[PDB]
């Protein structure tokens, strides 16, 4: 059962590529050496394939969020707005290795190893959330896919298709914002500043002599990190093996409830927000105004609440036990 | 090649002679070693060198500030300017020190068309029948042009640095003229030049000294930033 | 919480961007090395998608506050006048790393890389002022989301949403100052900003320590340019969760004054040993 959420971004989302990128001045990736050099962190780039109205297929990068970031912001999302409260209406108390297992897939970083009885493999894939995740030390496979967040784009068409073409993007996306790091050596300028620190203007002087002397690191420092720009349309694709009724209300709740979480890295500048604007459902649109509603929808929202209003931890600490 | 310049923000223009006197005065005894290297001494005597000063001093319009030229004068402001900021706050204690470090690259390449050049601390006081030769520029400029010259040959044999064989500089003039004495008791004063410019046909990177005496604060000028044209915004 | 705060400028407010530009006497960004080229620094720009009812979805360059400088401002805002005076009525005294963990997050150049235990956490996160900003020694997730500064316009209609869209300007939202003649291009005063800010699940005593930097976050000025009178702006309105709550006076009423009795509280409870525990390195 396939699920197409469109997400369009009102603050840039900056998703980190691993590795110590440089950058010159005006914006120069990995300059000529002997000019300026400062690091640069590259948002997270996927090369895809497409044809740039040439009609010869070539790689090109692709701004991207990673899946397996969204898929742990839906588990999250769906954690804490959806099924922790209702195990505190409860006043059930999940063990702490349940609490790792179910926010992490696993108790530990050793798997289990072996297969896992019938009976307990139905009861585990039914449940409405382990169901769609699995994982745990003994390895379950969830109900669950979630693909990239591609952004809609020419080098997308041939990815996602020609269903959204009329919101695609012909240049790129992605900007180079600039950051410091300042002293509060730069901003004493008087002794009646300094009178909340000890040893006063004397000790300010011996700690900014130590920092010329022997710190190198410092408080100083030039760069900068690359963010995709705000406003690019975005299309998730989520798909779900054979899910009950329970499980595709529970998803929707989380898409409901997801526009309160940010999609990735950036917290103390508010990168991440998104509003999500289109939500398809096996090729019907469900999304209102107010979110995933309608009478299509009734049945799975009535199944997820039968389902949310009986649930225990008995499940999550049965799923989080090892048979070691 | 390198030339770094330290600047101290103590929050009020001091000339560079009573900054470099009161340095001298603040390191008495301790480290004599770093004393005689920033007074530009001989090793075993207090005497100054006759040949070109590798510590500089100049007129910061926040304080005073500390040039190394070379490798050598880098290394020598390096290992210094924590003694001099221990010092100064050993004997100010009730005000912050700032320290300001900032290196330039030292530079000079040919132009076949000259650029305006100036620097405000000239010293072109020789004697007192030369001052009036101002008037007329054929006269001035043979001792002037020299001057220029030799300074330019003498700095850039102390930092190594090459120069084309072809320099050629005509002076345009100066602004107005000043008076400094080495105490404020003192009698004995010398004239000096400010905005005095003078065309050369070549490009001058990071800053430069011209003239002779530099260490006592005069003839420093950074030719980069005056390229900028920034002498605009000079009115009331 | 959201918090959406308005900002219009009586100065031209003058965040350079970094790298150097040249710009020509008719005023054309980069011209040919035929004309006579002069240095330009130029404003923070960033480029946002939008549509001019076209349609077309086209980036555009749009000159913004950023969210950092944002950060910044507000932060020592607080600290020096609301945090420091307290401090100082108390006679609290603070090391150097408190200090500067204080005003920049880490004390040194070199994290310690190391997880801090739970307890260290929840007292730190329910902090007053430390707990919005964080991020000390050990890294530490702070609970407020700083946007940058994005102007009322056409361009970023889709940046602020269904609202707000009556006070549009269209025109173009910079021009260039010439003081050979030092030319700094800066945003057209009197224009609005829009100034989001998101706390999560604050406690009372951070939203009134928000409310109070507010109330005197006008006295300070905006990305630098002390010099030439660059930077006034006064706050038009403030919505807190969907309500405003602003008034001439300043942020006040019968809906925001238990943030301040609350941060009172903090403030009159609260001492400098949570400073020196947050600034101690773990090493």
Known sequence: ?????????????????????????????????????????????????????????????????????????????????????????????????????????????????????????????????????????????????????????????????????????????????????????????????????????????????????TTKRGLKAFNAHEVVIAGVK???????????????????????????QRIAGGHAKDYGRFVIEDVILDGESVWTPSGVSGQATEQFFDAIAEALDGMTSSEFEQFAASAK | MFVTQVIFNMGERAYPDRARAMVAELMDGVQPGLVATLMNYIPGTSTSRTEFPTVQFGGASDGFCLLGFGDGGGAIVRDAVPLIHAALARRMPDRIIQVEHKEHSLSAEARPYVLSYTVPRMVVQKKQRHAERLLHEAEGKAHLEGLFLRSLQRQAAAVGLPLPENLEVEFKGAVGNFAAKHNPNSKVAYRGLRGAVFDVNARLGGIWTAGFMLSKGYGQFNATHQLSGAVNALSE
Do not use: C
């Not at chain 1, 190893?113 to 039914?126: H, K, L, N, W, Y």
């Not at chain 1, 975005?234 to 309160?260: M, T, Y």
């Open chain 1, 1 to 213: 059962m396939q699920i197409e959420v469109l997400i369009r971004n009102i603050t840039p989302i900056f998703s980190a590529a691993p590795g110590s990128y440089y950058v010159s001045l005006d914006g120069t990736i990995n300059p000529p050496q002997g000019a300026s050099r400062f690091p640069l962190t590259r948002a997270r780039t996927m090369t895809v394939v497409a044809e740039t109205g040439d009609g010869v297929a070539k790689a090109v990068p692709l701004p991207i969020v990673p899946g397996n970031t969204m898929r742990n912001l839906l588990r999250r999302t769906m954690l804490k707005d959806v099924i922790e409260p209702a195990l505190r209406d409860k006043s059930a108390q999940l063990s702490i290795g349940a609490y790792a297992t179910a926010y992490a897939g696993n108790s530990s970083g050793n798997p289990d190893g072996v297969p896992s009885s019938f009976d307990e493999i139905v009861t585990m894939r039914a449940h409405p959330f382990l169901g769609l995740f699995g994982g745990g030390p003994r390895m379950l496979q969830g109900r669950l896919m979630v693909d990239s967040l591609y952004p809609i784009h020419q080098f997308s068409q041939r990815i996602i298709g020609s269903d959204y073409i009329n919101d695609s993007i012909k240049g790129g996306i992605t900007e180079i914002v600039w950051t410091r790091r300042n002293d509060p050596i730069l901003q004493l300028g008087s002794p009646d500043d300094a009178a909340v620190i000890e040893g006063g203007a004397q000790a300010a002087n011996d700690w900014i002599t130590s920092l010329l002397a």
């Open chain 1, 234 to 260: 975005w299309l998730w694709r989520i798909n779900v093996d054979r899910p009950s009724e329970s499980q595709i209300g529970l998803i929707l709740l989380a898409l409901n409830k997801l526009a309160n």
